[PDB]
Design a binder for these strands. Sequence first.
DNA 1: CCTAACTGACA
DNA 2: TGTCAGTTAGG
Length: 105
Amino acid sequence: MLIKGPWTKEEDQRVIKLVQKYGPKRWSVIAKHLKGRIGKQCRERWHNHLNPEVKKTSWTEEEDRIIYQAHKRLGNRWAEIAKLLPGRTDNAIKNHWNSTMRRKV
DNA sequence: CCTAACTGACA
DNA sequence: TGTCAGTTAGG
């Protein structure tokens, strides 16, 4: 039967409302309503740039300058960079770098 | 280039 | 259980 695979439909529609109600710090409970997409699955879709709580402004200049600096000293510490960078959680700035800025300017 | 999607290791 | 560091997948 259908299980795992891409994350959408009865996936976002759940975490999307459950996060705005509880918050991204109860993945253990959030998971219970996602049927099989438990524990980590919910976190995977989220904590990146999905959070409707942060409009998809994306990288351009005022943010593209972050990786160029933040990574230059704390790149391998995406967790703290992300914390000091509201919006792009510990995943957006991580994959962005290793795809877009994969040249360590 | 851009976000999404997951795994292994760690706190 | 959640986070932390890196890699993978589709558009």
